Amino acid sequence: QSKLGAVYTEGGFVEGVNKKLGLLGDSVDIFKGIPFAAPTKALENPQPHPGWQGTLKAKNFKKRCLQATITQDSTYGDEDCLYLNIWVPQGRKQVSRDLPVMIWIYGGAFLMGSGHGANFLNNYLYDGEEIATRGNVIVVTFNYRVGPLGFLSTGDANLPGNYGLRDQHMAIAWVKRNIAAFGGDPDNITLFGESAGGASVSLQTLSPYNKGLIRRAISQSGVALSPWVIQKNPLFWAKKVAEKVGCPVGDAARMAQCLKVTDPRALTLAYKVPLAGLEYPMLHYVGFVPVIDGDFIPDDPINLYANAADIDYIAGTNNMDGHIFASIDMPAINKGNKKVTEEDFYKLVSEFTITKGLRGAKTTFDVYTESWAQDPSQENKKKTVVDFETDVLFLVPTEIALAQHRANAKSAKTYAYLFSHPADHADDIQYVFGKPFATPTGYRPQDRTVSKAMIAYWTNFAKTGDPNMGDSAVPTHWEPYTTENSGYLEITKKMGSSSMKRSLRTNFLRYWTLTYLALPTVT
Ligand SMILES: [Zn+2]
Ligand SMILES: [Zn+2]
Ligand SMILES: [Zn+2]
Ligand SMILES: [Zn+2]
Ligand SMILES: [Zn+2]
Ligand SMILES: [Zn+2]
Ligand SMILES: [Zn+2]
Ligand SMILES: [Zn+2]
Ligand SMILES: [Zn+2]
Ligand SMILES: [Zn+2]
Ligand SMILES: [Zn+2]
Numbered sequence: 001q002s003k004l005g006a007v008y009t010e011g012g013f014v015e016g017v018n019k020k021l022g023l024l025g026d027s028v029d030i031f032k033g034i035p036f037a038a039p040t041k042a043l044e045n046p047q048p049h050p051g052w053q054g055t056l057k058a059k060n061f062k063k064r065c066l067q068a069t070i071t072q073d074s075t076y077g078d079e080d081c082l083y084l085n086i087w088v089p090q091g092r093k094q095v096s097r098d099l100p101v102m103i104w105i106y107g108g109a110f111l112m113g114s115g116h117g118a119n120f121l122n123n124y125l126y127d128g129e130e131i132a133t134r135g136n137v138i139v140v141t142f143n144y145r146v147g148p149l150g151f152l153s154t155g156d157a158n159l160p161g162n163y164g165l166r167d168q169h170m171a172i173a174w175v176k177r178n179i180a181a182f183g184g185d186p187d188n189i190t191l192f193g194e195s196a197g198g199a200s201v202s203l204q205t206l207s208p209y210n211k212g213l214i215r216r217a218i219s220q221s222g223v224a225l226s227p228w229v230i231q232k233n234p235l236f237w238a239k240k241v242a243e244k245v246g247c248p249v250g251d252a253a254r255m256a257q258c259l260k261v262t263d264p265r266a267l268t269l270a271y272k273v274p275l276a277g278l279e280y281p282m283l284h285y286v287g288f289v290p291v292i293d294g295d296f297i298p299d300d301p302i303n304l305y306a307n308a309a310d311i312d313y314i315a316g317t318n319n320m321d322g323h324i325f326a327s328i329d330m331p332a333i334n335k336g337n338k339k340v341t342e343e344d345f346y347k348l349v350s351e352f353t354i355t356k357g358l359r360g361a362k363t364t365f366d367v368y369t370e371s372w373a374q375d376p377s378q379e380n381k382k383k384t385v386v387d388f389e390t391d392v393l394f395l396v397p398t399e400i401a402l403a404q405h406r407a408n409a410k411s412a413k414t415y416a417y418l419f420s421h422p423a424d425h426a427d428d429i430q431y432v433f434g435k436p437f438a439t440p441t442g443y444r445p446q447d448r449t450v451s452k453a454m455i456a457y458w459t460n461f462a463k464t465g466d467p468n469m470g471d472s473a474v475p476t477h478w479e480p481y482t483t484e485n486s487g488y489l490e491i492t493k494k495m496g497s498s499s500m501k502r503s504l505r506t507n508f509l510r511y512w513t514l515t516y517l518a519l520p521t522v523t
Contacts (some may be wrong), residue, residue: 003090004029006055009178011035013055016086021133025092028133029182030085031058036174037082037167040065040145042264043152043159043256046082046170061085061124064114065145065167066264072272075265077114084142084171085115087128088182096183100190100462102131103140103175105168105204107195107222110151110289115141118423121439130434134452135459136471138184142171144200148241148267151288153234158256161234161291168200169209169296176213190216190462194429198222198315199229199290202401205311206304207296216312216465218458220428221321224301225397225404228286237271237287244270281351282325283393302400305408312465313405314458316417316488317398320426322389329389333382340381342369348385352392357522367511387505395505396512402481413465414481416488418504421450432458446493453495476500 002025003018016031034056037046065081068074090096104126106113117125128139144150144167153161176186191214193201202224204210205217222229231237238259239249245266247258259267273285292300323333329348332338346365353360368388372381398416406414419428430436431451436443453475460470467478475495479487487502 002092002094003027004088004095004182007031007181009034009181010174011049011051011056012053014058015055016058018090019129026133027090028129029088029090030129031088031182032060032085033058033062033083034086035062035082036084036142037170039080040082040149040163040167042079042149042262042267043163043260045163045166049082058085061114061116062143064143065164066149066268067112067146068268068272070112072269075268079264081143081145082167082170083115084140084174085128086179086182087132087139088184089132089136089138096136098185098188099183100135100137100188100459101140101175101179101184101186102137102190102192102459102462103142103172104128105144105191105193105197105200106141107193107197107200108146109228109286110164110196111147113146113196115143117429120423120435121442123435123439125429125435126433127438128433130438131432131455131459134434134437134455134472135462137459137462138179138182140171140175140179142168144168144171146288148270148288149264151231151290152238152241152259152267153231153291153293154238154252154256155234155291156252158253159238159259160293160295161231162293162296165200165203165207165290165296166209168204169207172204172210172213188215188462189213190218192218192220192432192458193222194220194432195222196289199224199226202315203229203290203297203301205308205313206301208298208307209296211307214311216461217308217314218461219313219315219398219401220432221317221394221398223315223398223401224304225401226393227397228283228393229289230297230301231287231289231291234291241267241270276328276331278328281348282328283352302404305404308405308412309408309410310412312413312461313402314415314417314461314467315398315402315405316419316491317390317394318426318428319418319420320386320390321394322391323386325393326386326389330385333385339378340385342372345369345381345385345388349388353516355521356516356519360516360519360522363515363519364511367508387508391505391508391512396509399504399509400513403483406481406483415461415467415478416481416486416504417478417491418488418501419491421492428454450491450493454491457489 062083150164198219199222350361436447456472457467
């Protein structure tokens with residue numbers, strides 16, 4: 001009477017686990033390993049999963065999709081990987097009904113990842129329990145295909161790409177059809193995700209495939225407009241894989257069929273991103289990622305924002321988001337006794353600005369090093385390299401997406417945030433998922449303060465489209481973003497009325513969107 005029991009889904013009955021919480025009757029129903037699509041075929045679109053007899057025991061996480069290990073030496077996962085997981089919070093009087101539903105999409109550069117995430121202190125990163133119970137929402141996590149098996153493409157109908165995006169869409173569609181049986185409101189689905197998962201969230205809101213399926217969305221440190229998201233030259237990367245695995249490269253149709261019958265582990269390990277040193281910046285080796293296929297992604301994403309006109313939207317970034325790519329591109333920023341020089345930074349900047357030639361390199365170098373005259377310290381110079389990568393990879397694309405979403409909004413509300421703290425401790429995921437409460441020995445009181453506020457905003461937003469209005473109190477009134485106010489919430493360990501700010505790095509936003517674009521293209 002206060003828990004779900006066997007749940008009737010379209011494929012048949014599903015039985016999960018009930019976990020009693022606290023002393024006074026609360027609990028949480030946990031389902032792991034519900035199939036939402038058939039066992040996958042290499043480089044083919046996902047298909048419906050056949051129904052089953054009896055009661056499916058949804059007791060354990062299922063295998064992730066076949067992917068390279070972090071050493072890039074071998075693989076793990078399996079072709080049979082399109083499974084999802086559900087947390088349903090339960091009160092002490094009766095079973096929950098009409099709850100907001102939040103669907104998480106993990107990141108990992110479209111190359112790695114699973115629905116449970118990394119395990120640390122006996123706790124999976126994307127364990128939805130804390131969000132679900134603290135926010136009174138349902139949380140869904142799931143697997144999608146990554147790497148070459150998720151995104152290999154010829155740029156044409158022989159191998160159209162975007163298999164992993166279709167996987168995500170199939171999980172969303174399954175949730176819309178089935179989640180009411182678990183106590184969810186299918187008209188109130190919020191997607192949220194980080195990095196590649198935030199770009200995926202963005203792409204799902206822009207795809208006509210999701211018409212009528214999505215109510216709201218949250219992009220964390222990634223949008224469809226980020227430069228690492230759309231592969232402009234997929235045939236080049238498909239040919240690189242073909243050559244490594246022994247497929248001919250003269251005919252696209254012959255190459256595509258050969259790739260489809262190659263050992264999927266060989267496809268997965270065909271290319272390895274060199275650690276160091278690289279000839280180009282890290283951004284250059286972003287390979288197997290979404291493409292404009294004229295189908296799932298019908299056009300350049302900048303042109304698709306009418307599809308999100310009635311999808312409420314949060315988008316934000318982390319203060320130091322670019323530091324991973326910056327550390328690869330300029331290792332000196334790690335070692336305290338190693339200098340970054342004007343010459344090193346010019347070189348990096350010139351790699352990013354090649355299409356506008358010498359002039360574009362200089363104008364960019366000049367604007368980012370303007371402060372180096374008064375402050376030539378290595379602290380300021382290394383911060384400049386990180387801010388540069390953060391701007392071009394995350395912040396500027398996020399600000400353009402916010403402006404595009406606002407300009408196309410009908411009923412949709414738009415919100416912006418900047419997360420500033422103090423894996424790495426500066427990252428937003430662990431606070432969104434409430435890890436400071438799930439493994440409190442690894443965290444300080446101020447961390448639980450931050451996580452409490454983020455879960456309040458996120459789940460208020462899921463419930464109502466208004467991060468300030470819902471089951472939870474918030475520390476700062478989060479004002480909706482407009483072109484006029486260009487406001488963002490700065491999320492930190494102590495928030496108050498001044499945490500609502502405006503015009504984040506607008507001189508740099510204006511440089512990239514007006515000044516740099518006004519420069520003549522060079523060939
Ligand atoms: Zn199955
Ligand atoms: Zn696993
Ligand atoms: Zn297998
Ligand atoms: Zn109802
Ligand atoms: Zn569909
Ligand atoms: Zn390049
Ligand atoms: Zn170059
Ligand atoms: Zn980070
Ligand atoms: Zn992150
Ligand atoms: Zn902290
Ligand atoms: Zn207001």
